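Honest question from a wet-lab person: if I give you the sequences of every part of a complex, can you actually get the arrangement of the whole thing, not just the pieces? Trying it with mine:
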Amino acid sequence: RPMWYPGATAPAHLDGSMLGDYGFDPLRLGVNKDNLKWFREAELTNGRWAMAAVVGILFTDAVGLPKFWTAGAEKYALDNQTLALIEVAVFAVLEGKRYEIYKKTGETGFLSFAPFDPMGMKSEEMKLKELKNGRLAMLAFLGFCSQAAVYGKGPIETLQLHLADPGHNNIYTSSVGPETAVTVAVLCVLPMIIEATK
Amino acid sequence: LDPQIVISGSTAAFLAIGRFVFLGYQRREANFDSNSTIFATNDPAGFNIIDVAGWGALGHAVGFAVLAINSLQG
Amino acid sequence: AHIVKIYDTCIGCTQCVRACPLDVLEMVPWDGCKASQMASAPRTEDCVGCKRCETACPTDFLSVRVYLGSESTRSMGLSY
Amino acid sequence: PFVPPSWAPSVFVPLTGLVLPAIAMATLFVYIEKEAP
Amino acid sequence: RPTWLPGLNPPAHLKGALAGDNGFDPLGLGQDEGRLKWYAEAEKTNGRWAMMAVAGILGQELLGVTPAWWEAGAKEYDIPAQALTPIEFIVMGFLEIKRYQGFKQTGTSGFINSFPFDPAGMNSPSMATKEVKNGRLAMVAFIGFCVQALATRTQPIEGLTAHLADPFGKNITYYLTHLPETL
Amino acid sequence: ATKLFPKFSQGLAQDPTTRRIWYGLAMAHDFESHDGMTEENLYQKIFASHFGQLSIIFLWTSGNLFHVAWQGNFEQWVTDPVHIRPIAHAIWDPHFGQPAVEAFTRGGASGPVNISTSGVYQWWYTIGMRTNQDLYVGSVFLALVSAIFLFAGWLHLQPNFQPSLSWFKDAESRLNHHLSGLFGVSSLAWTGHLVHVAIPESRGQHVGWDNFLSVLPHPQGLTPFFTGNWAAYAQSPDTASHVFGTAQGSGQAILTFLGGFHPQTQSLWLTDMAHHHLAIAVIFIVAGHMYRTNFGIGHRMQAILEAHTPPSGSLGAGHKGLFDTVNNSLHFQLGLALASVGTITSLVAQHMYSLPPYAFQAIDFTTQAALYTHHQYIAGFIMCGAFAHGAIFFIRDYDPEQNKGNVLARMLDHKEALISHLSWVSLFLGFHTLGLYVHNDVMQAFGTPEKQILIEPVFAQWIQAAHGKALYGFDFLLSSKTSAAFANGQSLWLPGWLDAINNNQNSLFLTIGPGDFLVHHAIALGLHTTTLILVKGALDARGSKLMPDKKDFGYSFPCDGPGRGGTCDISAYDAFYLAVFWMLNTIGWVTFYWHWKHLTLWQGNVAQFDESSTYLMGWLRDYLWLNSSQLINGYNPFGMNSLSVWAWTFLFGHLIYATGFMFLISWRGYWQELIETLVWAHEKTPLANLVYWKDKPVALSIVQARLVGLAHFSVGYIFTYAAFLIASTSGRF
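Yes, you can. This is the full assembly:
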């Protein structure tokens, strides 16, 4: 059972019953058993949202459509006032039906279908793959927003620019260079800090 | 004024008064002053390395003060 | 709860017990004084700390002392 | 350079004045009234 | 067992079981065996880094590099110093955490997961004493290199040749007194 | 049920009222009163708290540096530090209207900013800061230092890093390292910075981390230091025509003792300050080798204390057992530290206004006034804390069996004499100072100013003459040209010092008269009365005739009830409580005197103070009413200016002070009955009784009420005076 660094120790409440366990809880926010399930469901839905959002942002830059941070300013074939009213009206019923699913079963669902799987490949390994991909997509979305904050342009453009000069084009040579360098050094020292005390 | 002569003379004078004059008084006051390292030395009077450093420090301070005052030309 | 203590200088005049507004003190038999009685505090959980018993004590210095301790619903005299 | 952007006060002053104190007050309020097991 | 000060008995906390134990501890930093063994490992690795540093400085001077050993940091290189720091910190953190965890399982040095990292044998207590002594000499030599470059502005071999050419001169007295002429 | 908060007190966690939260907040740092606390754990918690405090201090300093480098005008202030006001930070407030936006937009900035009054611009300019890059680098460095200190605090609580109780009691080692390293080595390093950076930067030569290894601080390069020819470092100093920051008129010396002030910056010479730090560094390092730690040589403080008893028995046992009662009591050490720090803070205020060390500091009147007032108020609060901790030591750590016959026990043996004499001195000073004031007021009211009593301060004027002032005409010591003391310093420091002290345009030994005499007696009255309250509370802390067993109730308790005539405010905490008011009154008198004398000095009319400081009506009209006209006009029906924030702060302080009077006058009982009626009202109201409280609402305790009232009183006092002082000094100049 690999941990979040070579030589970690579970904080007595992450024994491994949950999928994708690595003993990562320094703030100990999952000390409560009741909060662990809710936080897990929140992590799963945040991961699903980030997965769909990252795939959508990556697809818009390939075709040539407007950037993800400027797509809202574009004029569509509707009114923004009516869009917000419809969005909160549909999501009220959708989120209400999803919340009642978690109280009866404990996982996500769509509308009145708690185990929503028309094809049927709901396996234990598939649940962990969803969590891993969701975590990766959450970091990817944070990276998309951060790259657009300092460099702008776009994710695909950022990757293309990094290939031109990898030794000179990175987060360390950008406007947030020293902060991230100090943070990387502090993070690299952190496992030794935890292992020195234990 | 030769700095080497003044410093050497002051250090030698303080070491001499610390080894032949105030050694007994210092030993009597240090014992009555009541982890450690015993700095045992082969000196017949018990004058160890710590005493050498202390008396040499006093001699150096006196010598540099004398040199400084003489340098002020007053 | 507050801490109520009785000392051996008590003369058994029973003035502290009569002045207690929550029935904390009482009189027990004793042999150290002429009155053959001594004050006692067996119900300190109901003491509020008004110190009326200290005001009623005639010995110098006082034979009964009240030290304000932990506060609860009874010690704070709360009816709600 | 360490120079913050021009829009930095318009984001940090409302944050430190309303978002952070609300979160801190809510978390502290929940912690004060939590009952021991 | 000869000690550092003649006529001075070695301390009780210092026994000849260690490699370079010469009974030298006037400050008493190794009272307990736990801190003593940790400091022994610290001394060995400090000496290893100093040995590599002195060897690198001497090799750079012997091979005629353009900047001196105190100017190699500011020299232009591919993948600038701003980008070299995080890569070095990440790889060093991994290597050092593996070295530290291997030290807890067994009280010896290593390399990632080879504890002890001893290929081709050739290990003996005498070799350990030689390693500790060479490390101490390298540490003193590195500090000498730093102070020599500070007060004389000359590289190690250059300063040594300058001292050999004129022994009664070009020493600490001349360099400390003729400081404006050097700059 | 039992609540989690507070985790350190099980009795408070079982409290079902709102008093639990308040007491948990006010008893968080009283580690000695925590549940299951030992001595070793106590020292470890204090160690961690110390590291956290250092982290906060360094982060605050880095924040000030960062804001000055970002939203300030340091790059423009260094060019013209006489006509450019320093900028503290920018203002971003959505409540500001348009006139407030253009009103606060000043100092050359592009938006609303705050004009700094802390004097960090002059300090940073004097030590060598010139560009915003330097302040940015210093801010990042201090932030890293703060993070390191915070990590050290967290690390010293984990296992294998917690220091033992024996390590915390090594007084000899700690004192040796603090005198030699924390004091001597730090001063030596500061001398290195002044000699290497500040002095060359003041002469127009940039010396930074990129070129300090190739730039010589002196043209002779360490040769005179090693050869003993130290006088070579004092040759060719800065002339009288030297322009700060440029090479015009600059010299080559690095260690001088010219004395006096710089003719342009009106501040102490940088070479003199460097030489000062070098001398004190050598002295402190030498003093750091006095105690015996691990090498046989040195002293044992217990031996020196035990061998210091007079033979006639005038001091009884002398200082026997004083080493144990100090080393084993943290309140004794805290009281000694606070007493010394408070006195040093007062010393800093006096020396900083009289001998300005930073360039262009004397011209900044607002900075001088704010700095003096700030340090004097801080010193007063620290002094009150020193005496409060002395009382806490008497109650919690004093042992009469261990301190038998020594000076400590003898103090309590004759405490009545000390309290009575303090009372007599305070009574005499108050009666006479008030009588002379009322007499002068009646003489000024009846139209006979020549009939008021004006006692000339001949003793202080005699001291001023001894320092070199020839205005009074005593002509002795430094005032006489034929004295040995005068002739022995004419070649080292007396010329500059005499030229500076005989100048009536600075604050170096200002001219004094009868008004200064009277206000000095008022200051003496304040000091003696505050000392009387604090000393009486510390000596009567263990008991008195009214409460023979006061030590059995702790340092802070409400009272002993209405019996035995009444025992309100009988604890030592209440004595400190009453003494805070006297401290505020004393600091108010000293700051009022300082501000009025300096205002009349800066305005060019010292005769106004000399003729109006002898009666209280002059103080109320010519100083309080006259100088508050611009303050109260910050915002009026015709508009507002940049001074409206001080007017709002003035009214703010008045409101807080008055709010404090409520907790100070009305007591618990009335509020508890009112709260009970409110409880009934909430319980009997529909649509609102569905929401219930978790803690039972109760009135604030007697001790809590006193603390809350004093906090409001002090906050209102400080804010009101700060707003008035800054607004009057900035508007007038």
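Two things worth pointing out. The first helix of chain D runs from residue 8 to 32. Chains D and B do not touch (no CB pair under 8 Å).
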